[PDB]
């Protein structure tokens, strides 16, 4: 049930790391290179572990992860849609 998501991704507790730009994510527990304004201390309900593409703030673009690249703080992650 965690492998399928609908729209902007607040229900994805998946595993994908690769973004739409082919760039890896930075760990949710890591302040380097990006200091998480939202981290696994204010929203423990969400499953934010290692560098998995997770959207906890319900952003319209889609499931995201704090991008490893210093250039961009957050980028989406390729995924199909649950339930066709």
């Amino acid at each position, epitope marked *: 049930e965690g492998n399928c998501a609908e729209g902007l991704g607040t229900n994805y507790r998946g595993h994908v790391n690769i973004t739409r730009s082919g760039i*890896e994510c930075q*760990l949710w527990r890591s302040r*380097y290179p990006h200091k998480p304004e939202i981290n696994s201390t204010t929203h423990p309900g969400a499953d934010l572990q*290692e560098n998995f593409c997770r959207n906890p703030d319900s952003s319209t673009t889609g499931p995201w992860c704090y991008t490893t690249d210093p250039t961009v703080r957050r980028q989406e992650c390729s995924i199909p849609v649950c339930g066709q």
Partner: antibody
Amino acid sequence: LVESGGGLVKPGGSLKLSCAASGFTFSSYYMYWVRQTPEKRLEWVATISNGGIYTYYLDSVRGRFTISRDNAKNILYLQMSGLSSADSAIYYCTRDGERQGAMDYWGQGTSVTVSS
Amino acid sequence: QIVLTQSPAIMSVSLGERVTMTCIVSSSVSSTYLHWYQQKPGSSPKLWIYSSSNLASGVPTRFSGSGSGTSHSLTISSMEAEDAAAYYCQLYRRSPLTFGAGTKLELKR
């Protein structure tokens, strides 16, 4: 800051081992356990999250080791099982730290071996 | 990714000479996920380099981190001799995480 790191030689089977870690807050940092075989080789042996929510393990370590911590008592624990001859190692308990899955504060280091 | 190989096994470097330690990993899926350490003879390991070229606290400023693809190498250029230790290369990779093979830095007299 400081971890104790007890333990000793066990020739038969499982060993109960732990590090008493205090000085910082255990509600904000992951714990890491690292072993070092006598042939100067380290294989990371499991790691625990800020609670008991998510714990890891190596390919040969899954199903044998076990990492859990007690935040209130400021103690970090590690239980081994099926300690074969190749499993002898100088283990180190380590603080997550520095972000990005680093190894901030390594413990004192306990020498553990098996030999009958 | 997933796994990691190191190179070489044993070095015997002198005092005041530039030193490198390659870490041939498979394609370096995250150039800022690889770290190095030391282990002085009889000690616990201490972090030196975390997430490529960014030193931890108290690390001598003579270290460096490359790693723009499939090859990560340190560059220690220091006049002091205390750097004699077994430096280990670790790339963070979740469950299949692996350390280096050891690049034990011995001395020369």
